[PDB]
Symmetry: C3
Subunit: 315 residues, 3 copies
């Protein structure tokens, strides 16, 4: 049995060893919980974004950045892979814990979800849960959580607060852009499960996605970071048994395709948890089926929409 919280805790300790280099800052609160700021009152960095992504994926994914071009324009890209896709993506990475503690609101991702069982149905579906006495959570938020928030997280995870760590970054920050593009494989796995495909059948997944420039506020950044995956995110997946249903994985099969994610976000009143989950999906996928030995390709890339989404200005 692997422990995503223990593996991720090792990465968080590495992050804390290099705080100044990574442009992050931590604080131990009055109950002993550790809050790591990766973007609210600090700049963060590409490497902090990679480490935050690795932590969200329970330490069970490789994540790196390579610079490449789209129609000759240079971007940083995330390239990543995992051989524990259900656990890394659904059991850890997905932001499946909505944190609401009086006026404090955050989207919660990462290994702590596998202790608190958030949501319970996910852990039934992937047949995984952790048992650790350390909890590691990743918060997408424009404010840092206080003692009361950390005490609530600790309680839900059945751990002491002194054994809770939270990484925190806002949507519009470099760590935000990196970690959200770092969910490229997770988008595919999540969309596959939403359409009824058993994620326990998925053997491995590898993905690439450009890293959104940082737009002027958290709301517009929600749009462009998500469009990175929807219009320009590519996944190679290996599965035990193919299902014709997987033709409906790519975003271009959605009635909302062509729309800026910012549009969809606005209609949900800027509440991420009011977005229809059936809308998150990768631009393109290739699915290697171990049963037939065939590889089925679905989807397409769309630089035109992406450059609109990224507020690119050409000469």
């Amino acid at each position: 049995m692997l422990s995503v919280n223990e593996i991720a805790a090792e990465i968080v300790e590495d992050m804390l060893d290099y705080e100044e280099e990574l442009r992050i800052e931590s604080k131990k609160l009055e109950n002993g919980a550790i809050v790591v700021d990766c973007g609210v009152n600090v700049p963060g960095s590409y490497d902090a974004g990679i480490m935050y992504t690795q932590v969200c994926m329970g330490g069970l994914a490789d994540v790196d950045i390579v610079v490449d071009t789209i129609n000759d324009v240079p971007f940083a890209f995330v390239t990543e892979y995992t051989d524990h896709p259900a656990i890394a993506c659904l059991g850890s990475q997905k932001a499946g814990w909505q944190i609401k503690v009086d006026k404090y609101f955050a989207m919660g991702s990462g290994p702590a979800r596998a202790l608190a069982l958030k949501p319970k149905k996910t852990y039934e579906r992937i047949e995984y849960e952790d048992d650790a006495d350390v909890a590691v959570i990743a918060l997408e938020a424009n404010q840092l959580p206080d003692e009361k928030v950390m005490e609530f997280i600790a309680k839900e995870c059945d751990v002491d607060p002194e054994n809770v760590y939270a990484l925190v970054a806002p949507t519009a920050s470099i760590v935000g852009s990196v970690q959200i593009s770092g969910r490229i494989v997770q988008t595919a796995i999540f969309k596959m499960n939403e359409i009824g495909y058993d994620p326990k059948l998925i053997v491995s997944g590898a993905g690439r996605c450009p890293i959104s420039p940082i737009l002027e506020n958290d709301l517009k950044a929600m749009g462009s970071t998500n469009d990175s995956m929807m219009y320009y995110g590519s996944v190679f997946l290996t599965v035990k048994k193919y299902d014709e249903i997987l033709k409906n994985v790519p975003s271009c099969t959605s009635r909302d395709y062509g729309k800026p994610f910012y549009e969809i976000f606005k209609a949900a009143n800027y509440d991420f948890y009011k977005i229809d989950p059936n809308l998150f999906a990768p631009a393109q996928i290739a699915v290697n089926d171990l049963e037939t030995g065939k590889t089925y390709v679905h989807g397409k890339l769309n630089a035109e929409v992406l450059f609109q989404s990224y507020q690119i200005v050409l000469e």
Copy 2:
């Protein structure tokens, strides 16, 4: 003073510390030999694949995976380089030792070849021999080696079985796919030797090759993994003195070029013998000549053949 077996054993010790994360399993046999299953009864992983390949190359190469596209279809690629191409590729990685013990048969690669000296003529040519009390072999096989097999290998290496490690994966497995595409530099070096170009003249090489999808059995996989290099493997090589014979390195200069290996092999009725050996070669190379300061490009890529080989189904 570089020991490919000592360096490789350190990598194998790492693989042992992370078995469950890598999805591999090890057994210590009655004679003490350690057999590490990287794909027979276990799924393996992309990282087990990279480490397997690093082991094959004696620890003297960098090997990593990046996700990229071919005609927009996503694949995982190996990207690799070495500054010891003779030792890493000829003295270690090449599957140059046919292991035949009763009815057990496997192609052996990796550092143990440099203790067994298999074949002797290679070690004379590259002016390398290892001197070590530990042997690390990598076996491409559908069955794990038992006590008697490991005793045989240890005898041939002159090491006590207690100090022999074998990594094992079948041709159709993720480790199989990764480690075979991870021979992209080795196929250039080996083809260069084959056509009469002294490997001692070769300074370094750096290569890129897509990782084949896993096909439905070892024989089809033998085809697709090899076609990765023959139809879509690229190598940049640096040499002390270029000779025009090197125009013959690319696989496209073989009389047998043009169909997927498995179909060529079908056409030879499973007969190694009746296929031009010059077919085993990279798709394209660029050769930086240190003498003239020119860089000579030969060969081409072939996505059309690659996609037949990979049994790609487009919509």
Copy 3:
């Protein structure tokens, strides 16, 4: 505070633990200075080139090599990024220390610059100074510095020669080619400062640049290594506030744009420090402005000129 010398010294100690693997050679001089030959009487290596580049950037950058193609011709590329672009690129990397000790000439780069403050105006512009009592310099030179040269460097940095390290490689060497393409982010940051843009406004930068083949002498190599960046170097940059003057960052906005830099190296008398500093610029940039949330793209790639600089011979 981040000490570029203390961090870089750790990289050099790592290089000293793997000399034979990296194909480098070190000597401790009489005064205790450690001279690491990375390319003068030894071959060096791609990995030695990456570590030399990392040391030039003060350990404050990520540097890796990926193999990819330009018009299908395979090359090794540097992919790199930093979140301390003023410190790493201008405070450390730029070769801003002209070394002239009797008959010994070298271009000096690297963290020792931030101890000797060379040139002073740079340290005033970026507001950085180091306080280490170790010094690490990178010399681009075709001969190894002796006891007297290292005495001069140690004195200028206010450190005992026993605590000084020098890395040394000529322009025509693998370490030369890697390290110079490894300045792709720095070329953008330097040009930005040149045209009056405060480098303190620069949040981060990420770049890709092909690694030049080694040409037949240091003079031709000065041309092709530099053309890598000027004709095929791409940079993604983040800044706090955009300024329209940044439209003049790309090399193609210079009067002299269009011919290989080999013609330009002569029209400065083969003196690097005689070259007009406004020609020294990246091929293409994307500038993400945090204020407006827009990303402005300028410049263009030029494979045709690159293949000429590189002395590519196609069939």
